[PDB]
Amino acid sequence: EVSQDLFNQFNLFAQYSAAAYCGKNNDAPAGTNITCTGNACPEVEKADATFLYSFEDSGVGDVTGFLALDNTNKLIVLSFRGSRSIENWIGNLNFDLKEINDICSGCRGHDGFTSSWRSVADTLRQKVEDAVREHPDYRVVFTGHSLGGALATVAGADLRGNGYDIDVFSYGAPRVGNRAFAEFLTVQTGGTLYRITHTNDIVPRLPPREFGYSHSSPEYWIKSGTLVPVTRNDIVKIEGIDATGGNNQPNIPDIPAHLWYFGLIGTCL
Amino acid sequence: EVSQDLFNQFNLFAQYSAAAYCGKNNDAPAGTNITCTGNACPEVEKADATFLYSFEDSGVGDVTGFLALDNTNKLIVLSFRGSRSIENWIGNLNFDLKEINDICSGCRGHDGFTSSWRSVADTLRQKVEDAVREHPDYRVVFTGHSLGGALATVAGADLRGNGYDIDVFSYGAPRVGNRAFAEFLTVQTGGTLYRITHTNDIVPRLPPREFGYSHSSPEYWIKSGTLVPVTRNDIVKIEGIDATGGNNQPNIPDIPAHLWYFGLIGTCL
Numbered sequence A, B: 001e002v003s004q005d006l007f008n009q010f011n012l013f014a015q016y017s018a019a020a021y022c023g024k025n026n027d028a029p030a031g032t033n034i035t036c037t038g039n040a041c042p043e044v045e046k047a048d049a050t051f052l053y054s055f056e057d058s059g060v061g062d063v064t065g066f067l068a069l070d071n072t073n074k075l076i077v078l079s080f081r082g083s084r085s086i087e088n089w090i091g092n093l094n095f096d097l098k099e100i101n102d103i104c105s106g107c108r109g110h111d112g113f114t115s116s117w118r119s120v121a122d123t124l125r126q127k128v129e130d131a132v133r134e135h136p137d138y139r140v141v142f143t144g145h146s147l148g149g150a151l152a153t154v155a156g157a158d159l160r161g162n163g164y165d166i167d168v169f170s171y172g173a174p175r176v177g178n179r180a181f182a183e184f185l186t187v188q189t190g191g192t193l194y195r196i197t198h199t200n201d202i203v204p205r206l207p208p209r210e211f212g213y214s215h216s217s218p219e220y221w222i223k224s225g226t227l228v229p230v231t232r233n234d235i236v237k238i239e240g241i242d243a244t245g246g247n248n249q250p251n252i253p254d255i256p257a258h259l260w261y262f263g264l265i266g267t268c269l
Ligand SMILES: O=Cc1ccc([N+](=O)[O-])cc1
Pocket: A061, A062, A063, A082, A083, A084, A085, A089, A147
């Protein structure tokens, strides 16, 4: 239902996201090639892909991830890890909203997601600008799964509009703010957000609409099951803020579906 | 390189094996439909398959598993469950052997597997016997992954030749005993053993040859990668007691390769 070029991009960045969990040693130097345990990021390994900066429990929100130069696919990639324990993070998930009038002219976002990022926006904005300078023709791309999804989405909306396009690929990200933020994430210029969801994954169903949260449009919904390989015919585009007929169904939700995005994610073999 | 049918049989008993870990068993009364979380055993779910006898932490061996009836496939399946945490099971793995002349003359098996089975032998024989009586038409099948695979091979070696055949399907099972036992298992009629390995899986390499251990023939070796689908062409039949070229090859072993037999196994999404 979407292009092959798009499928390749979705798979590629899903693997970059998984590397945020299974890319051995955050206490690694800058410069060394990027590798994963248990076949988590084969397409990332195939490419000339090295670390530029690694960060762990960084800031007030204990943010984790890496900045990567890919010289094969011509990308600069900021990748956010999600929670080391999703079950917990889900149960412990606070629903409070906060005003974000810097980013957004009348928007409320999730206090935790907004705060974790805001505490590291400065350093990480610098790290990206140095790369963007060193590689003007390289695509700047922000990506993440679960918590990392949200964080990427917030960084993307906060750092866009500065001369360089920032594209956002998020994987099972939760709702990140209110109706207005949803619209600002839908029409914002300086990139494209591809908000990927999988079947009855529970996380892109939280915090609930019933708490003021709303989903940006569109959504790229993966129909194929958990532990099933994904083909471009299993992904459906869904237009409309808080659309239904995708991840937003009245049915019974599921945690495993959250951990299978094109391949294993959010945990490491 | 294997028939479509045999392939289907391999996939089926891989899922009965994973059902040992991810089933909803214990406080799951007799007659309960067998289901798994996180799509761990769809084929088992598709079949008219019910628990006949669950067990958890039975005897000196902390032996866990279930006895299942399958009216669809006409099976009595005794699925043995491996360890709750494999890495710690591995680092603590005792290499001692004890005598087992009750199974074969001059035979010695890993003291531990053989003790664990013994402590539950009489009880599980009874339950198998009952079900062989109600459904004599049904093919008795013993299956397991990892440690579960070990118990199965030793259980079915012990219980064969009492009327009914007992097939064994094992998934990354370790060596079970000394050479005289390997030769036995290779020939013992009244049930075929299908010993299955995946690429550079660490488990089927312990306990090491040097400690008195020897693998049975044949070996069905899976060429395809961790988290890759298996097709008929990715499986290879390897002849010869202790043959090399399959799993028994001189490269670094892998724990993740242990967790991908046709699907996720030994861990639950
Ligand atoms: O250690 C797991 C973990 C859980 C939640 C969070 N967080 O929400 O920041 C971070 C790490």
